[PDB]
C-alpha cells in the first residue's frame, strides 16, 4: 500500500544515509591541508569580442580551441576566430529566444535551442556558401535548457519538462528518454569518456545517467536551491555543482558523497556557470555580482577575481587545451582571459 | 604583416559587422511586450512554443509574445512592458490571480519592468453584480468597509454597486503594486470588455509613459 511503500522508501533512504556516513572518515580539507598553496592567480583580459547587440546567453569552444560559437537574444549565432577577433559566420535564427549553444567536436555542425521547444542543427562546412539548417528536432514540451553533442550524429538535450533525451540527427528520433527528475532540468555536463552524463535540476538534485543503458545510477542531494551549472572533473570521477544559494560543491562518484564546499561569507549571489581547468586545480565560478571567482579545487580558497564585467556572467568556458577562458555577459561583450 | 587571406578574412568580418549593424538599427525600432495571464481570462481577444502577434499603431510596431513563469522569466528582462490579464468576473480565481501577480511583481529579474494590468470581462462583472445571485463579500472578507471614493470617474451609465466592485478589484492589485516597489516600476490598470476595438491605443499610451520614464531616468532628470 501507500504506507508500506512510504515505509520502505524511508528505510532505504536511512540505509543509504548510514552507508554514506559510514564512509565519512577523512574529508578533503583534512588531507589537502598539507599541500603548497597556488598563490595568487592574476590573469587579465586579452581579447574583447564585440558585435553582439543583446544579452549573450551561451558560448561554446571548438575542439580546435580557436573557434567559439555565441548565441544572443537578438537572434544570431556568431562563430569567432579568437586569435584575431574575426567573425567567420553569422547564422540568422528563426526564433530570437535562444538559451543554448553546441559546437560539434568535429566542427561541422552547431546547435541552438530555446523557448521555441526546438533544437536546430546548422551545417557549416557545406558548398553553396551558406550555413543552412540540417534538421529541426521536435519532441519536447518545454524550453530547451542545454544541448550537448555526444558525437556527429548524436545529441543530448535537456528541457523544462523534467526530462532529458537523446536524438539521432540523421534519423530524428529519440533513442532514449531520461525520466526521473522532479523539476526543470537546467544543465547537463557530459563525462570525458562520453558514456555518462550528470544533469542538475531546480529540485536541488543531480543524477548521474548512463547514456547507453538508460538508467539513473546515483542521485546527489546536498544543495538547498536550484542547480544552474554543473561540470565534470577532467578525470571524469567528480563534478562541481553551482547553485542559487552561492555554494559550490565537489561531488564524488565512487563514494557518493560531497568532498569540498566552496562557499564564502561575503557572497550571496547564486552561481551562473562553473568550469574547471585542464589540470583540475582551478574552479572558475560565474556569479551575479558581475565577476568570476577562481577557487582552488583541492583547498577551497580563492585565488583571484576576473572583475571586468558590468552585468552578470551568463556563460563561461575553458579551452580543451587550457590556454584561455572566455566569459560572456549580459552586457553583450565576450572576453578572453589568459 | 598579414597575408592576403588574412586581409580577405578581415573584409568578410567587416561585411558581417555592417549587416549586424543594419539588423540592429532595424530591430531597435520595435517595442517588445510580454503577455501573461493564466487562463479563463481572454488572452486571445486582447488585441484584435512562443506565439508572437505583431501589430502597428501610430507607425510604431509591437511584438506581443505569450508563452504557452518560473525560470525562463529572465529571458524577458529587456522587454518594455508586461501585459497582465485578470478575469474580474470569476471570484474564486481572483486570489490565484493576485498571487500570480505578486510573484511576477516581486521577481528579481523584473525589478525594472512595468506592468500594464488588464481586467477583462467587465460586462460579466456587471451582470453578476446586478443579478445578485453571488456576492463578492462572500469570498472576499474586506468588501464591507470599502466605499466608492469621491472621484468615481466611471461613467454615469453604471450602477453604484458595479462601480464599487470594479474599483475594489482595482484596489486589490494596486495595493499590491503600491506597497513595496521603491518607484522603479509602476502598474497602469485598465478595464476592458473583450468587445472593444480601441484596445491598442491604451497599450500605446502606457508605453509612451514607460519610455518617457526611462528617458528621464536615464538622462539624470531624477
Amino acid at each position, epitope marked *: 500500500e501507500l504506507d508500506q511503500l512510504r515505509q520502505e522508501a524511508e528505510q532505504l533512504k536511512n540505509q543509504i544515509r548510514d552507508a554514506r556516513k559510514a564512509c565519512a572518515d577523512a574529508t578533503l580539507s583534512q588531507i589537502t591541508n598539507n599541500i603548497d598553496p597556488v598563490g595568487r592567480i592574476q590573469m587579465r583580459t586579452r581579447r574583447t569580442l564585440r558585435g553582439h547587440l543583446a544579452k549573450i546567453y551561451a558560448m561554446h569552444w571548438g575542439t580546435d580551441s580557436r573557434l567559439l560559437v555565441s548565441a544572443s537574444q537578438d537572434g544570431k549565432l556568431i562563430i569567432w576566430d579568437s586569435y584575431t577577433t574575426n567573425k567567420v559566420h553569422a547564422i540568422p535564427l528563426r526564433s530570437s529566444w535562444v538559451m543554448t549553444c553546441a559546437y560539434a567536436p568535429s566542427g561541422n555542425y552547431v546547435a541552438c535551442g530555446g523557448l521555441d521547444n526546438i533544437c536546430s542543427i546548422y551545417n557549416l562546412k557545406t558548398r553553396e556558401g*551558406n550555413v543552412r539548417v540540417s534538421r529541426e528536432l521536435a519532441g519536447h514540451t518545454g524550453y530547451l535548457s542545454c544541448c550537448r553533442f555526444l558525437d556527429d550524429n548524436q545529441i543530448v538535450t535537456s528541457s523544462g519538462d523534467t526530462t532529458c533525451a537523446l536524438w539521432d540527427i540523421e534519423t530524428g528520433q529519440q533513442t532514449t528518454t531520461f525520466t526521473g527528475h522532479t523539476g526543470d532540468v537546467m544543465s547537463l555536463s557530459l563525462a570525458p569518456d562520453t558514456r555518462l552524463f550528470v544533469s542538475g535540476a531546480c529540485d536541488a538534485s543531480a543524477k548521474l545517467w548512463d547514456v547507453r543503458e538508460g538508467m539513473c545510477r546515483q542521485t546527489f542531494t546536498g544543495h538547498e536551491s536550484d542547480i544552474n551549472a554543473i561540470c565534470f572533473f577532467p578525470n571524469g570521477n567528480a563534478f562541481a555543482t553551482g547553485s542559487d544559494d552561492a555554494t559550490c560543491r565537489l561531488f564524488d562518484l565512487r563514494a557518493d558523497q560531497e568532498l569540498m564546499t566552496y562557499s564564502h561569507d561575503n557572497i550571496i549571489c547564486g552561481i551562473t556557470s562553473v568550469s574547471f581547468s585542464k589540470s583540475g586545480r582551478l574552479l572558475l565560478a560565474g556569479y551575479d555580482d558581475f565577476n568570476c571567482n577562481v577557487w582552488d579545487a583541492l583547498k577551497a580558497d580563492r585565488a583571484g577575481v576576473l572583475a571586468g564585467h558590468d552585468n552578470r556572467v551568463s556563460c563561461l568556458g575553458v579551452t580543451d587545451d587550457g590556454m584561455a577562458v572566455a566569459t560572456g555577459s549580459w552586457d553583450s561583450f565576450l572576453k578572453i582571459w589568459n | 604583416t598579414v*597575408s592576403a587571406e588574412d586581409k580577405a578574412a578581415a573584409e568578410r568580418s567587416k561585411m558581417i559587422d555592417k549587416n549586424l549593424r543594419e539588423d540592429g538599427e532595424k530591430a531597435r525600432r520595435t517595442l517588445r511586450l510580454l503577455l501573461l495571464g493564466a487562463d479563463n481570462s481572454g488572452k486571445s481577444t486582447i488585441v484584435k512554443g512562443i506565439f508572437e502577434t505583431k501589430f502597428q499603431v501610430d507607425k510604431v510596431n509591437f511584438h506581443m509574445f505569450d508563452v504557452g513563469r518560473r525560470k525562463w522569466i529572465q529571458c524577458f528582462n529587456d522587454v518594455t512592458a508586461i501585459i497582465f490579464v485578470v478575469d474580474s468576473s470569476d471570484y474564486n480565481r481572483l486570489q490565484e490571480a493576485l498571487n500570480d501577480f505578486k510573484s511576477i511583481w516581486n521577481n528579481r529579474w523584473l525589478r525594472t519592468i512595468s506592468v500594464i494590468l488588464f481586467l477583462n470581462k467587465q460586462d460579466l462583472l456587471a451582470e453578476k453584480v446586478l443579478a445578485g445571485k453571488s456576492k463578492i463579500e462572500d469570498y472576499f472578507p474586506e468588501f464591507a468597509r470599502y466605499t466608492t471614493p469621491e472621484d468615481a470617474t466611471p461613467e454615469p451609465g453604471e450602477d453604484p454597486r458595479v462601480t464599487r466592485a470594479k474599483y475594489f478589484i482595482r484596489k486589490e492589485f494596486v495595493d499590491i503594486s503600491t506597497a513595496s516597489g521603491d518607484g522603479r516600476h509602476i502598474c497602469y490598470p485598465h478595464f476592458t470588455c473583450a468587445v472593444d476595438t480601441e484596445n491598442a491605443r491604451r497599450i500605446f499610451n502606457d508605453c509612451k509613459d514607460i519610455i518617457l520614464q526611462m528617458n528621464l531616468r536615464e538622462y539624470n532628470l531624477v
Partner: single-chain antibody, 231 residues
Framework: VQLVESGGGLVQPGGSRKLSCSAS????????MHWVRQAPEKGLEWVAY????????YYADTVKGRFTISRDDPKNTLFLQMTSLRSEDTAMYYC??????????????WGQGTTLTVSSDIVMTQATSSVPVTPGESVSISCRSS???????????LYWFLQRPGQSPQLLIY???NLASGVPDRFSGSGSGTAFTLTISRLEAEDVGVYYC?????????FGAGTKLEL
C-alpha cells in the same frame, strides 16, 4: 553549382569585348571571384580579382589599365572588360570562386572557358616538366619557391591543382596539407618552406593530367609550368 561563361570569339587587334560569368547555385555576393587565363600553349596565369561586395580589386601587372572587372550582385554576373587588345591576350578564360575565412578552401570551383583569339613576384617553377607514370605506382611531384611560403602564423599558403585533358582544373591540396572535398585520400602533401612535394599513392586512371602549384601569399598569384603525368 555551375559557373557558365559566355562571350569571347574572333576579335581584331586593339578592339574591345565583354566577358560574362553567370552563376547558379550559391551566395554569389559572399564570394570573391577571380579570372585566370591559359595561353593556347602555356600554362595558367592570373588576371584579375574582385572581392565580396566589390571592395578590393587586384590586377596583374600586364593587364593594368586595359582590363576592368565588375560584378552584378542582383543578376549574379561577373564582367571582364577588354581595352586595347593585343596578340598576347589569346587564351581560355576561367572564372573561379574563392571564399576566405578560417577553414576555407579557396579556389574550389572553376568554370568553363571562353576561347578568346586576337587576330618582384614569387616566381616558382616545377622542375619536373614531364614525368612518366604506370598504373598502381606512386609518383611524387615537386615545387620549389623563391621566397618562403611559411608565414609567421604557421600557415603555408601553397595550393595544388589538377587539369584533366580538356577540362577545367580542380583543387587537390590547400595550405600544403589539407585535402579538398571529393578528392580521394590517396593524395598527400608535404613540404617545408621553399620545398614542396605532392605524393600520390596508387596512381590509377582518371588521375593523369597537369599539376599546378600556386602561392597565395602576395599578389600577383603565380603558378608553375605544370607536370604532365602520361603512361
Amino acid at each position: 553549382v555551375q559557373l557558365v561563361e559566355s562571350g569571347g570569339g574572333l576579335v581584331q587587334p586593339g578592339g574591345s569585348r565583354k566577358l560574362s560569368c553567370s552563376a547558379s547555385g550559391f551566395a554569389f555576393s559572399s564570394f570573391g571571384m577571380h579570372w585566370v587565363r591559359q595561353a593556347p600553349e602555356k600554362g595558367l596565369e592570373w588576371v584579375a580579382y574582385i572581392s565580396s561586395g566589390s571592395g578590393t580589386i587586384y590586377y596583374a601587372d600586364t593587364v593594368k589599365g586595359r582590363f576592368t572587372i565588375s560584378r552584378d550582385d542582383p543578376k549574379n554576373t561577373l564582367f571582364l572588360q577588354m581595352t586595347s587588345l593585343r596578340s598576347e591576350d589569346t587564351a581560355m578564360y576561367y572564372c573561379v570562386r574563392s571564399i576566405y575565412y578560417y577553414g576555407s578552401s579557396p579556389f574550389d570551383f572553376w568554370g568553363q572557358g571562353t576561347t578568346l583569339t586576337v587576330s618582384s613576384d614569387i616566381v616558382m617553377t616545377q622542375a619536373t616538366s614531364s614525368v612518366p607514370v604506370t598504373p598502381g605506382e606512386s609518383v611524387s611531384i615537386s615545387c620549389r619557391s623563391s621566397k618562403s611560403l611559411l608565414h609567421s602564423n604557421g600557415n603555408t599558403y601553397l595550393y595544388w591543382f589538377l587539369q584533366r585533358p580538356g577540362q577545367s582544373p580542380q583543387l587537390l591540396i590547400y595550405r600544403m596539407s589539407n585535402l579538398a572535398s571529393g578528392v580521394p585520400d590517396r593524395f598527400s602533401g608535404s613540404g617545408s618552406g621553399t620545398a614542396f612535394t605532392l605524393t600520390i599513392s596508387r596512381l590509377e586512371a582518371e588521375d593523369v593530367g597537369v599539376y599546378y602549384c600556386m602561392q597565395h601569399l602576395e599578389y600577383p598569384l603565380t603558378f608553375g609550368a605544370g607536370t604532365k603525368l602520361e603512361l
